[PDB]
Each structure stands twice: as C-alpha cells, then as structure tokens.
Amino acid sequence: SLIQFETLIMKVVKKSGMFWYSAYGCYCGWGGHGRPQDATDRCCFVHDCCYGKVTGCDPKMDSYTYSEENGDIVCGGDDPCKREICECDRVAADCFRDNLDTYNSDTYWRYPRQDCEESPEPC
Amino acid sequence: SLIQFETLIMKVVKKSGMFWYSAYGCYCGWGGHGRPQDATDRCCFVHDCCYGKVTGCDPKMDSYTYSEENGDIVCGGDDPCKREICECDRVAADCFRDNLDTYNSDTYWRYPRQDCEESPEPC
Ligand SMILES: [Ca+2]
Ligand SMILES: [Ca+2]
Ligand SMILES: [Zn+2]
C-alpha cells in the first residue's frame, strides 16, 4: 500500500518521500503525463507503469509483506499478487537511491505543467 | 527531522498516504509566503513559525526522541532544543488531522504562487 511505499522510501533511500518526491518532474506525484525529465522522474514513470500492470489486487490499498535481509528489502512471496505490488514499490525505492547523484529539485520541484503536456511514453 | 515529521503525520493523520502536505496552499511545502488560505494551510504557517523560532539545533536534520503511549505522541528525551522541534511537529500533525474535514487539494494542491505574493503576517 502507499503507506508501505512511503515507508520503503525512507528505509531504502533514507529520505522523506513526501517532501522530496511528491511533486517532482512530470511523473513524481499523483498522476503523470508528458515525458520523464530525468532519472528520478523515470523511476516514477516506471512505478506508474508497474502499478498499471498489476491485476488481481489493488496496488494502492492492498498490503503486502516484506523483511530485511542484510539491510536489504525482500518481498514476501506467499501471496502472488501482493508480491508483485511490493516489487513495484521496492524497485522504485531502489531506483530513487541509485539516482540521488542526479536528484535535481532545484529544477524539477513543482516543474511547470506546460512542460508535461506531450502524450506520455508507452509503458 | 523531516523523516520523523513525515512518520508523525502517518501515525497521527492515519491517512498520510493519500493526504499530502508538500505543496498545499501557501505554506504547506518548501518555503512559504503570503497568507494561510485555509485551516490546513494555517497549520503549516504556524509550523513554519515554530521552526523559525528555534535556535541551538536544526529542525530539518536533527532527530528527536518520542514515544507512542497509547495513541498519542509524547515528546521526550533530555534536550530542550530537540524536544522543541518535536513539539513543532506534534502540534502540526494533530492540526492536520483535526482539519481533514476541510482539506481541499482540488483547490489548493499546487496553488498558483502568484496567490501568495503578499508579505506574510508576523508569527
Ligand atoms: Ca505519478
Ligand atoms: Ca512552509
Ligand atoms: Zn494525454
């Protein structure tokens, strides 16, 4: 669930997802349209694409399981659908951490809407 | 720290996953100027004032101590400066939660900046 996704960002990226990734670029935030503006923005585009390929459960409200093996996050596989949800959040959290080197809020925080008007890239 | 502030929002508002406070009104988000547009927005104005009235520690990166006795967040530790930071966060979180009935993101999410170019009133 979004609550877990939110907690995963703090655990893996060791940063606040609400105050650093809820209005970034063209896809980091609710919804999304246009083209991802950078690496962090592509992470969100992929996450949106991931949630959209999940069938058999709800990626926003359904809760999944996960543990910590060696400071890393492992998703529970007992329930097949929910593991697919965890993977979407897990892969996004790691994507944010690996791209911190180029995180550019100075430019993309509250990025003008006119910049995200193009038709979105296919998933 | 921002991570703790976010964690306190998740714990108090019990719905921090769908109610964001990163770009709401004139004061819920980075910076702040003009005047509170509503109740939630006033919660952020008072919070910004609370962070501005602190010296001796950093409210952004310093971590404070706190417990969850029952359902409340009790600020503790043995540092007046950090317990101050915790109180700024504790109050704001409750404020957000007590004003959920008025939360209006349809209107105030990504509120145009030109609507906040008035000089702010004193704290
Ligand atoms: Ca999005
Ligand atoms: Ca503010
Ligand atoms: Zn379109």
Curated annotation (Swiss-Prot), chains A, B:
Positions the record marks as coiled coil are: none
Q: Which cofactor does it need?
A: Ca(2+)
| Catalytic residues in the record | H47, D89
Annotated Ca(2+) binding lies at Y27, G29, G31, D48
For this protein, the record's InterPro entries field holds: PLipase_A2, PLipase_A2_Asp_AS, PLipase_A2_dom, PLipase_A2_dom_sf, PLipase_A2_His_AS
Which UniProt keywords are listed? Answer: Calcium, Disulfide bond, Hemostasis impairing toxin, Hydrolase, Lipid degradation, Lipid metabolism, Metal-binding, Platelet aggregation inhibiting toxin, Secreted, Toxin
Gene Ontology biological-process entries: arachidonate secretion; lipid catabolic process; negative regulation of T cell proliferation; phospholipid metabolic process
Origin: domain of life: Eukaryota
Q: Which reaction does it catalyse?
A: a 1,2-diacyl-sn-glycero-3-phosphocholine + H2O = a 1-acyl-sn-glycero-3-phosphocholine + a fatty acid + H(+)
Report the Pfam families cross-referenced here.
Phospholip_A2_1 (PF00068)
Q: In which tissues is it expressed?
A: Expressed by the venom gland.
Q: Which residues cross the membrane?
A: none
User: Can you list the GO cellular component terms from the UniProt entry?
Assistant: extracellular region
Indicate yes or no for the key word Disulfide bond.
yes
Disulfide pattern: C28-C44, C43-C95, C49-C123, C50-C88, C57-C81, C75-C86
Which CDD domains does UniProt cross-reference here? Answer: PLA2c
The listed locations are: Secreted
What is the free-text note on the cofactor? Binds 1 Ca(2+) ion per subunit.
The UniProt entry lists the main location of this chain as secreted
Q: Which GO terms describe its molecular function?
A: calcium ion binding; calcium-dependent phospholipase A2 activity; phospholipid binding; toxin activity
PANTHER family with a match to the protein in the record? PHOSPHOLIPASE A2 FAMILY MEMBER (PTHR11716), PHOSPHOLIPASE A2, MEMBRANE ASSOCIATED (PTHR11716:SF9)
Q: Note the subunit structure.
A: Homodimer.
**Per its database record, what is this protein's job?**
Snake venom phospholipase A2 (PLA2) that inhibits ADP-induced platelet aggregation. PLA2 catalyzes the calcium-dependent hydrolysis of the 2-acyl groups in 3-sn-phosphoglycerides.
Name the chain's protein.
Acidic phospholipase A2
Give the classification, highest ranks.
Answer: Eukaryota, Metazoa, Chordata, Craniata, Vertebrata
